[PDB]
Each structure stands twice: as C-alpha cells, then as structure tokens.
Design an enzyme around this catalytic site. Structure first.
Site, short mmCIF file in Angstrom:
data_model
loop_
_atom_site.label_atom_id
_atom_site.label_comp_id
_atom_site.label_asym_id
_atom_site.label_seq_id
_atom_site.Cartn_x
_atom_site.Cartn_y
_atom_site.Cartn_z
N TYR A 69 0.82 -1.20 0.00
CA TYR A 69 0.00 0.00 0.00
C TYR A 69 0.85 1.25 0.00
O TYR A 69 2.02 1.24 0.39
CB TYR A 69 -0.92 0.02 1.22
CG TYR A 69 -0.20 0.27 2.52
CD1 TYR A 69 0.45 -0.78 3.17
CD2 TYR A 69 -0.14 1.51 3.11
CE1 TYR A 69 1.11 -0.60 4.35
CE2 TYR A 69 0.55 1.70 4.32
CZ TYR A 69 1.18 0.63 4.92
OH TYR A 69 1.85 0.74 6.12
N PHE A 71 2.15 9.61 3.69
CA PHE A 71 2.45 9.33 5.09
C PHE A 71 2.93 7.91 5.35
O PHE A 71 3.43 7.65 6.45
CB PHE A 71 1.25 9.66 6.01
CG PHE A 71 0.03 8.81 5.77
CD1 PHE A 71 -0.12 7.59 6.40
CD2 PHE A 71 -0.98 9.26 4.96
CE1 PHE A 71 -1.26 6.83 6.18
CE2 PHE A 71 -2.11 8.50 4.74
CZ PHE A 71 -2.24 7.29 5.35
N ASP A 72 2.83 7.01 4.38
CA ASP A 72 3.25 5.64 4.61
C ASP A 72 3.32 4.93 3.26
O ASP A 72 2.58 5.26 2.33
CB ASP A 72 2.25 4.96 5.55
CG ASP A 72 2.79 3.74 6.23
OD1 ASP A 72 3.97 3.37 6.01
OD2 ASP A 72 2.00 3.14 7.00
N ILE A 106 -7.22 0.13 10.64
CA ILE A 106 -8.37 1.01 10.64
C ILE A 106 -9.58 0.31 10.01
O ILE A 106 -9.46 -0.59 9.17
CB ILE A 106 -8.07 2.35 9.95
CG1 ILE A 106 -7.64 2.15 8.49
CG2 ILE A 106 -7.04 3.15 10.75
CD1 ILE A 106 -7.52 3.45 7.70
N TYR A 153 -8.58 7.36 11.71
CA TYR A 153 -8.02 7.69 13.01
C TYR A 153 -8.83 8.73 13.77
O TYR A 153 -8.41 9.18 14.84
CB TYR A 153 -6.54 8.09 12.90
CG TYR A 153 -5.69 6.97 12.38
CD1 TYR A 153 -5.22 5.98 13.24
CD2 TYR A 153 -5.37 6.89 11.04
CE1 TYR A 153 -4.46 4.94 12.75
CE2 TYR A 153 -4.61 5.87 10.56
CZ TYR A 153 -4.14 4.90 11.42
OH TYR A 153 -3.38 3.86 10.93
N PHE A 209 -5.75 5.75 0.06
CA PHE A 209 -4.84 4.62 -0.08
C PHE A 209 -4.94 4.00 -1.46
O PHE A 209 -6.03 3.88 -2.03
CB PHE A 209 -5.15 3.50 0.91
CG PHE A 209 -4.92 3.87 2.35
CD1 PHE A 209 -3.67 3.70 2.93
CD2 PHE A 209 -5.96 4.33 3.14
CE1 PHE A 209 -3.47 4.00 4.27
CE2 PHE A 209 -5.76 4.63 4.47
CZ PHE A 209 -4.53 4.46 5.04
#
Ligand SMILES: [Cl-]
Ligand code: NA
Ligand code: NA
Length: 128
Positions: free
Chosen positions: A45, A55-56, A75, A101, A118
């Site tokens: 991902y 962010f990731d 999540i 979140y 995502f």
C-alpha cells in the site's frame, strides 16, 4: 488526481451506506473469492493525506504489510475494504476519519479529523 477521482467517482462500500469508505477497482484480481474473516492477508500500500503528503508506504520498506482480517488490527476502512478485494486486485480507497483515526489522529504524521487516500494491492490471503 486520483484522490479527487475516488472522492467524486468511488463506490460506497460501507454497510451503513454513509459514504465513509469509497472504492475504485484499478486492477481486477483473480477469480471470485475474497478473503475470510481471520485470514492472514498480505498487502502492499501507499497512503496520502488530503494535503498531498505521503504518510506511509510498504513498497518503500521492501516488505508487505500483514494482518488478520476483520479483527480491528487496522483502521476500519481497511478491514471493510480489503474484505471486498480479490487476490491480485489493486484498488483505491477514500477513508473518512470515522473509518480511520478519528479525532485522535496518529502521530507522527496523521492529523486529527483526517480523510485518507490509499492505493492497496491484495497480494495473498491464507487461512491459518
Ligand atoms: Cl493522482
Ligand atoms: Na482516474
Ligand atoms: Na473486488
């Protein structure tokens, strides 16, 4: 770009039909089977905030992210979204904070009340 497109053109996949998780299938996967609750799922991902920041990314780590489906280890949007996917599928998800979140956010990079984008590839799933 892709976040705007899933926002405006995505399918609501929530059971409540509250628009909290929107999906577009980018690459159709294999067969017709989706994972089972409790399966070990392997994903790649990338995640972006609504300000455009990445962010990731699992790709950047050279390893997939592995979790047990439907157990709240991720999540809500991921438990819901990955459950809809076939092996080999790539999708886009647009996740409102109630399915992510929430007001808490997640340090260091996810602010309060954040809508998240995502791209997710379902690499494999296995019952254990
Ligand atoms: Cl884009
Ligand atoms: Na597009
Ligand atoms: Na699917």
């Amino acid at each position: 770009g892709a976040p705007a497109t899933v926002t405006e053109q995505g399918e609501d996949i929530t059971s409540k039909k509250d628009r909290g998780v929107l999906k577009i299938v980018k690459r159709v996967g294999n067969g017709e089977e989706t994972p089972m609750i409790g399966d070990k799922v392997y994903v790649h991902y990338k995640g972006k905030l609504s300000n455009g920041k990445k962010f990731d990314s699992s790709h950047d780590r050279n390893e997939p992210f592995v979790f047990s489906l439907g157990k709240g280890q991720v999540i809500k949007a991921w438990d819901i979204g990955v459950a809809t996917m076939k092996k080999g599928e790539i999708c886009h998800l647009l996740c409102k904070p109630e399915y992510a979140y929430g007001s808490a956010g997640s340090l260091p990079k996810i602010p309060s009340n954040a809508t998240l984008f995502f791209e997710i590839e379902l690499l494999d799933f296995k019952g254990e």
